[model samples]
Target: AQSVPYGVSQIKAPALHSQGYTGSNVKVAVIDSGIDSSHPDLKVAGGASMVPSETNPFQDNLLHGTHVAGTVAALNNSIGVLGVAPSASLYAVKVLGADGSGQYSWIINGIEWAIANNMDVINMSLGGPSGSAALKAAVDKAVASGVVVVAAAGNEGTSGSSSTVGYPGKYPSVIAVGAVDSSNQRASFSSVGPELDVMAPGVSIQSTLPGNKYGALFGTSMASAHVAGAAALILSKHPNWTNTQVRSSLENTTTKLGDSFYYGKGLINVQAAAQHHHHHH
Candidate 1:
């Protein structure tokens, strides 16, 4: 057995990788705080910043974006760790700033940039309570242009809360992802609602950090990265698939753990998605 992260193997991504689907020719845009392009385990193909005063989007003041990028496309080299789509070209579209807070406009700009670049997938690990017509329009437009949009379901769910999923993710066109622990149990912090489309491993997910280090992160953010990477893997095999086709393949192949409000369609199975053929007998 090859050395792969629990999250990667849990989704059977390594199995798909062994079948020659390493996300080659697939481009994923990680719209987050920014990334450490200098990180040895990460290879950022390109990026841009929507936040002012943060000109250099390659520098990661907050480890959030770097960690997220690592989960999506950390190099497959025999070193620190492997991402779900280890060969996918990662683009760091910085919307959040040093303080980890970004305006809605910043996020919109990042989305536009991703669409303009013809990115295969766009992962938004950030969210808010209220909905934005502008953001929704951006997501809708991206999907219309064949870009698969994925976002975190948010960390607002509690025993007493209701419909905590936030904007962009709440948009029907986006793939809203929830979080599950190592035991395949939903993370208490994972937001839930009818908008959540799927679930992925999120708790204690070990991925790349700044300064050539590795650590664990817990959030729907981590879960969203897993789905984005999985999407990349699917696209690598079916390069001609539309955004809607990619989304449906993922939803149909999910492990089906819980209701729509909790686990959505359940944990993502990259192997099943990769092997899914349109001409089945």
Candidate 2:
């Protein structure tokens, strides 16, 4: 068995794993910069690059996608960190570039690719203020096609007032994830708003990186990956559940931290979701 990361353990992913739901056969698309498919701790089933310049989906120049991928599905091995759904099939839907930004069309295309490729879950960790009609349309269409769209709530937390979540995460159809520390305290940088759906560990999250490496980073990026992996775990067991059901299961099973504006439903518990959803079968 591999060493499980704190965030994964904190979310009680092992509880679901013991139930034999390690996201087997669940296709998860990491729609971001890219993923280092060659990493020893990762397994990339397949992918595509919507970025105009960096077209290779396997090369993780920015390491953001790779990090998020690791948290979502880093393989259960002896050396590296175990992910939330270590057996989930990972696909590098490269929508962002090395600079960690990309065109709106690129993001929409990545969503389109995820839908076209029959992805069970889509983890989008990138964000911007460019929320538009087309992006909303694409995300709504993705969820409508039976795909769970999980996105970061963004790092633009507002202490005073107003919402900071952006783009697809702000859209009603997507599950906007907020951030919290290992101690279950909300990360001050985690964007908070009524649209924010749930919270997960984001501070000092250790996961895989490019070129056979590992590191820690923080943001709503890490938060979303955990939820995405949890989504995969749920789908692995409850294959008949719809996207809305998945979202409901997560939101209902979370450990509520504080104000809804800051913590959403609360820190997500993968085990609790599965255990609570045993009746659907």
Candidate 3:
């Protein structure tokens, strides 16, 4: 077995892993560029491409989605890093092009596909500045279908006092995730606002790159991926729970770090969220 990455450990995923609940059988859809399922450390269960031009979801030309996928389910083998939910089934829902740019329509289409496929969790590490009602409606529909939606809070935070959280993440139906370091301190680039729901490790996260490579990248994108993995773990244990149940379980179990605007509910605690039958206040 590979050593657990610090980000995975920071969220206390190992504790859940020890409980024999490594997100087994949970379906997690990574709604991003795409995922390189061939990476030694990663194995994608299945996927679809919404990039229009790219028909194969296994070919991740941009590498961003591959990295994001690694954080969610990099496999528990001895070759490379272990993910937060190492055994979780990963589905690549490619919405962005190789240039890392995509229109709102593509994202909406990806979300629709995830819901239709009966995906358990949806991880959207991308966002836009201007809000689109169509995109919001798609996301709302996904949540209403009992799919747990997670998205990055955008890396648009500035020293100026104002909220910079992006759309999709800004939607009430999605779990808005911000970035934090291993020390539980909020990453400076993490977007902040009352809409932010939680924090996860986002700085210098090491995960699979394209072509059998590994590298470290930072952003709330990585943070959002971590939360998606955690959601998969929670679902594995409680197959009967609804989307709102899993969402509240995560938010209510975080370890407080700082202000709600920046840290939200605080760093995610996977063991606490999944290790018990006590779902009471």
Candidate 4:
């Protein structure tokens, strides 16, 4: 069996519970591949199809979104992997379709839809190599509306030359999260750049799979989910932190990993961020 590192196990559920929040009704809008509600591990509160209505969202052809949702708030049924904020509600919005591909328009609309629905947090695991002015404006709008949006820094560890960041993440308003492995090293698959806001356990971590099983998933997608979970912890308790405040709280509390450029703010520490609220109060 693959061993979980100390940092990974450090996110204890009871500790999260101690913070006076369980993510209970906190709405998590996963902007990725659609979820598989039939999966025992994933409890779907609701969903929308970015694709034509004739298509089904449960196919999970790529499984990236399903894995991402499971990581963020898969129910703590005590039967599968326990997510960071198990009590939170889930809203699966299919921005990416089969083979993990979606046009920029669909992605933009997905964000708008989440905002319309009053989502407290939005988790986006998909990104292009760059960003558009329109998308940036939309992200700014989300922040203005008090929606905590988390985006993956992408799987490209670095330019390996000049070192440039991937977008949506590169956008200043979005909370860009990079991926770290159990060894605490930046996963080579984690994209690197100035936009990286924090790092989390993303390399081959175990999470809920469709069809009533558990499996290992990798990528910055998981990294974003970790931050999404952290946001849930804060929103569920505070329930009033502005979107920017949630963004600041999570970044402000991250554990500095090393001097490496990969982990921007460092790995996310749930207990610390959750406790920091009282300090602010």
Please give the CA lDDT of all the candidate structures.
Answer: 0.89, 0.91, 0.90, 0.77
Per residue, candidate 3 scores C-alpha lDDT tens digits across 39-84 of 8898889989988888998899988899999999998878778899
* Span of 10 residues, lowest total lDDT, candidate 3: 272-281
Residue 159 in model 3: lDDT? 47
Clashing pairs in 3: none
Q: What is the C-alpha RMSD of each candidate to the true structure, in Å?
A: 2.0, 1.7, 1.4, 2.7
Please provide, for model 1 over 32-146, each residue's C-alpha lDDT reduced to its tens digit, 9 standing for 90 to 100: 9888999988999998999998998888888889999999998888788899999999999989878768999999999999999999999999988987788889999999999
Model 4: how far residue 101 lies from native, Å: 1.6
Off by over 4 Å in 3: 276-281
Each prediction's total of clashing residue pairs, residues at least 3 apart in sequence or on different chains, is 0, 0, 0, 1
Candidate 4 residue-wise lDDT, 191-227, digit = tens: 8777788888888777767777677888898888888
Off by over 4 Å in 2: 277-281
Q: Which regions of candidate 1 fall more than 4 Å away from where they truly are?
A: 1-3, 159-161, 277-281
The lDDT-based order of candidates, best leading, equals: 2, 3, 1, 4
lDDT of 2 by residue, 93-124 (tens): 98877876788899889998999999999999
Candidate 4 TM-score, C-alpha based: 0.91
